[PDB]
């Protein structure tokens, strides 16, 4: 046993991918190299990284472009020690479970009655693929009230106390229609429904 | 004439047939014959209006999923002519295009204050196929008014609770709620829940 | 009524059951280069709730008494090893292979016992030497 | 164009819910038989990128059902016949009305989990293109 750092991959709004590892957990700083290919498919050829991320003059990650991304095909990566080959760690990743989307945008509120208001927001690209968490609170609440929301990007508030002051926010996630991603986006810029 | 049927999204299809004037001892039936299942179902039409007959087609356990988005059932209305079956009306029934779920159930007060009330319910017999693509609508009965003047409160998401604001202290209210899936071109709202009776709290 | 794991491996010895308690399962493994038929069975089940224990399915491969069930007849192309899934109360009998002296002291069989909520196989008291 | 696309989107989504419900049904702490269910060998498509490839799933539905019969316990109470006869009819509309395609299978077999994860991924890939 002579372990190699676990590699992490995140696909950022399906625009690109960061793969990283923290290397410093090994005597002798080492420029570790990364290769990848897609399993049981067309172009099951091995690929060098060609775009290395560094940390203190020692490789630390690898950024892949959209062209190189194929969700829905099993992505196989391998960390390789340059001096001793006989020590390599490979993993099979499901890229469609590692998408983080960007934060919801253009948060807007509008009344559909004196006492009823509705909240809308935008997401950069994916849409039919995302689900969301809405969180709101007043000046009176000791915590948030959340509620998950399907592909509609609407949230009803059928009963508002016009006297309280409301703080709204949303985050999105690539699940469960086009992927089974588990990590959420950053929160949106919050908005308020005033005194 | 007119022949309307709805599907509760599980194992229950209910029918309503209205005719412009049958004669004495008019024995009718609805026959369901699906286009890719191994079974048939029938039921005896029973009078409801002066000229309305109604029927329930029961396809299995209350919570069993007995049909799909791709099923097409040929519903037929049949009445006894001497010995032989005369077809009154015939329909290509797309069960997930004619949805009406059961009333929501188990209405209960989670918390009452003096100006506020959090009520919650459960949906009775919904397909798992819906996921979160449901929609709710509620209404509050307050002392001075009747049900039909009460604002329809809109939940454009699957939220199985509501938090009523700006209520009068120490006052009796009544509460009602209903559901609709987003899917189905002829899909309607459920009937309304049993009204939940509740009372706000006195102030100082 | 099903054992979590399977009988212990005793060095230089294999185990058979002379009879199979109802509910025992046998996988439909094939020889290399073969595969169980499209829309086939995954396993054969030992049912005998009519008093005359049978095997509910039957395995198939193609190119790429009273109470218990008997050993099932060999099908077309099998794997060398049959993989069984044994129910609780099942008895299994160890013996050294052709080329080894058995050293006995206590039962040469394993039983699948229930304890509170858990399953276990008793250790056969047997050593094999060349 | 849009309607038929939405009709297909929906059918796939429904299929997806069936597969994911089984997965969550068996792939969890409170299924005492899971370790034994992983010993069953399932067969995979060589490639699976368009609806016709579902012939590969349809063929493995009979085994699938046998595996579900074993999960039948007082936890998920997940009656198979109802569920497999449903998955079946959905699949048959999706793979469509040509019925000419003989399936190609991969060399290596897969545990039921690798199997359900494969076909879920299949549906999600198609769905993601459909709008
Ligand atoms: C199958 O469904 C029928 C009818 O349900 C209706 O249609 C379905 C498709 C859904 O959309 C439902 O939400 C919708 O209601 C059920 O029959 C109904 O049963 C109830 C209670 O037994 C009847 O209520 C009665 O109503 C009269 C008059 O309002 C009152 O006087 C009584 O006190 C009583 O509450 C209801 O009339 C009846 N509907 C009809 C028109 O037949 C049925 O029970 C259900 N079966 C199962 C097992 O699921
Ligand atoms: C009105 O009453 C209802 C019913 O009690 C309240 O809904 C409850 O809200 C809480 C707080 O968000 C939910 O807990 C959450 O559960 C999920 C797990 O699924 C978890 O991710 C969260 O961290 C949190 O623990 C709770 O499930 C939910 N109950 C149900 C069944 O919906 C509601 O908040 C009340 N409304 C107001 C305005 O207080
Ligand atoms: C993906 O990888 C890139 C490249 O390493 C990261 O970009 C760096 O971000 C940190 C923190 O903001 C800064 O040191 C630099 O501004 C960036 N490095 C440069 C200029 O190459 C990025 O953070 C990673 N993650 C994301 C979310 O894209
Ligand atoms: C379902 O029904 C098929 C046709 O049934 C006939 O026509 C209908 C409209 C009724 O009048 C019925 O009494 C007639 O028998 C049958 O041929 C078919 O086998 C049935 N399916 C099953 C398996 O029940
Ligand atoms: C890693 O590679 C870079 C450039 O290729 C180099 O500057 C750095 O010193 C290397 N580190 C080693 C080999 O220790
Ligand atoms: C934000 O949302 C509103 C309300 O739907 C929309 O009409 C408006 O065009 C959007 N604005 C931006 C900046 O995208």
mmCIF file of C-alpha atoms in Angstrom, chain B residues 18-106:
data_model
loop_
_atom_site.group_PDB
_atom_site.id
_atom_site.type_symbol
_atom_site.label_atom_id
_atom_site.label_comp_id
_atom_site.label_asym_id
_atom_site.label_seq_id
_atom_site.Cartn_x
_atom_site.Cartn_y
_atom_site.Cartn_z
ATOM 1 C CA UNK B 18 -76.559 11.731 -19.619
ATOM 2 C CA UNK B 19 -79.276 10.768 -22.099
ATOM 3 C CA UNK B 20 -82.241 12.736 -23.478
ATOM 4 C CA UNK B 21 -84.898 10.250 -22.275
ATOM 5 C CA UNK B 22 -84.672 6.451 -21.796
ATOM 6 C CA UNK B 23 -87.636 4.091 -21.137
ATOM 7 C CA UNK B 24 -88.676 1.897 -18.151
ATOM 8 C CA UNK B 25 -86.192 -0.845 -17.126
ATOM 9 C CA UNK B 26 -83.201 0.695 -18.885
ATOM 10 C CA UNK B 27 -80.267 -1.563 -17.898
ATOM 11 C CA UNK B 28 -76.871 -0.086 -18.863
ATOM 12 C CA UNK B 29 -73.175 -0.641 -18.365
ATOM 13 C CA UNK B 30 -69.829 0.902 -19.051
ATOM 14 C CA UNK B 31 -67.223 -1.446 -20.518
ATOM 15 C CA UNK B 32 -63.523 -0.609 -20.295
ATOM 16 C CA UNK B 33 -61.324 -2.488 -22.765
ATOM 17 C CA UNK B 34 -57.668 -1.349 -22.685
ATOM 18 C CA UNK B 35 -55.583 -1.563 -25.847
ATOM 19 C CA UNK B 36 -52.574 -3.291 -24.321
ATOM 20 C CA UNK B 37 -53.650 -4.913 -21.052
ATOM 21 C CA UNK B 38 -54.794 -8.486 -20.372
ATOM 22 C CA UNK B 39 -57.966 -7.477 -18.517
ATOM 23 C CA UNK B 40 -61.406 -5.961 -19.071
ATOM 24 C CA UNK B 41 -63.510 -4.067 -16.548
ATOM 25 C CA UNK B 42 -67.287 -3.355 -16.433
ATOM 26 C CA UNK B 43 -69.682 -1.543 -14.031
ATOM 27 C CA UNK B 44 -73.484 -1.073 -13.679
ATOM 28 C CA UNK B 45 -74.608 2.489 -14.387
ATOM 29 C CA UNK B 46 -76.739 3.871 -11.587
ATOM 30 C CA UNK B 47 -79.064 6.908 -11.775
ATOM 31 C CA UNK B 48 -77.957 10.186 -10.102
ATOM 32 C CA UNK B 49 -79.779 13.010 -11.935
ATOM 33 C CA UNK B 50 -83.195 12.927 -13.631
ATOM 34 C CA UNK B 51 -81.083 12.054 -16.678
ATOM 35 C CA UNK B 52 -77.612 11.256 -15.339
ATOM 36 C CA UNK B 53 -76.095 7.834 -14.729
ATOM 37 C CA UNK B 54 -72.797 7.249 -12.913
ATOM 38 C CA UNK B 55 -70.313 4.456 -12.502
ATOM 39 C CA UNK B 56 -66.975 3.510 -11.006
ATOM 40 C CA UNK B 57 -64.454 1.297 -12.766
ATOM 41 C CA UNK B 58 -62.193 -0.238 -10.118
ATOM 42 C CA UNK B 59 -58.923 -1.657 -11.355
ATOM 43 C CA UNK B 60 -57.166 -2.900 -8.205
ATOM 44 C CA UNK B 61 -55.843 -1.851 -4.823
ATOM 45 C CA UNK B 62 -56.618 1.819 -4.060
ATOM 46 C CA UNK B 63 -52.920 2.689 -4.436
ATOM 47 C CA UNK B 64 -51.885 0.387 -7.260
ATOM 48 C CA UNK B 65 -50.719 1.935 -10.515
ATOM 49 C CA UNK B 66 -52.898 0.170 -13.049
ATOM 50 C CA UNK B 67 -52.429 2.443 -16.104
ATOM 51 C CA UNK B 68 -49.784 4.513 -17.894
ATOM 52 C CA UNK B 69 -49.239 7.619 -19.964
ATOM 53 C CA UNK B 70 -49.245 5.303 -23.038
ATOM 54 C CA UNK B 71 -52.355 3.233 -22.267
ATOM 55 C CA UNK B 72 -55.527 3.878 -24.254
ATOM 56 C CA UNK B 73 -58.741 2.417 -22.940
ATOM 57 C CA UNK B 74 -61.817 2.109 -25.114
ATOM 58 C CA UNK B 75 -64.759 3.048 -22.935
ATOM 59 C CA UNK B 76 -68.162 1.942 -24.176
ATOM 60 C CA UNK B 77 -71.712 2.543 -22.947
ATOM 61 C CA UNK B 78 -73.968 -0.455 -23.461
ATOM 62 C CA UNK B 79 -77.640 -1.117 -22.780
ATOM 63 C CA UNK B 80 -79.754 -4.249 -22.927
ATOM 64 C CA UNK B 81 -81.786 -4.668 -26.105
ATOM 65 C CA UNK B 82 -83.742 -7.881 -25.496
ATOM 66 C CA UNK B 83 -80.792 -10.278 -25.316
ATOM 67 C CA UNK B 84 -78.089 -8.275 -27.119
ATOM 68 C CA UNK B 85 -75.844 -5.330 -26.293
ATOM 69 C CA UNK B 86 -76.582 -2.039 -28.093
ATOM 70 C CA UNK B 87 -73.697 0.464 -27.944
ATOM 71 C CA UNK B 88 -74.870 3.912 -26.813
ATOM 72 C CA UNK B 89 -71.530 5.738 -26.794
ATOM 73 C CA UNK B 90 -67.864 4.838 -27.382
ATOM 74 C CA UNK B 91 -64.718 6.770 -26.365
ATOM 75 C CA UNK B 92 -60.909 6.601 -26.769
ATOM 76 C CA UNK B 93 -59.972 7.320 -23.174
ATOM 77 C CA UNK B 94 -56.392 8.546 -22.524
ATOM 78 C CA UNK B 95 -56.210 8.020 -18.788
ATOM 79 C CA UNK B 96 -53.374 10.545 -18.151
ATOM 80 C CA UNK B 97 -55.192 13.164 -20.206
ATOM 81 C CA UNK B 98 -58.312 12.975 -18.056
ATOM 82 C CA UNK B 99 -57.058 13.404 -14.535
ATOM 83 C CA UNK B 100 -58.879 14.356 -11.415
ATOM 84 C CA UNK B 101 -57.267 13.274 -8.147
ATOM 85 C CA UNK B 102 -59.036 12.527 -4.862
ATOM 86 C CA UNK B 103 -59.598 15.418 -2.438
ATOM 87 C CA UNK B 104 -56.596 16.171 -0.270
ATOM 88 C CA UNK B 105 -56.941 14.564 3.174
ATOM 89 C CA UNK B 106 -55.788 14.723 6.825
#
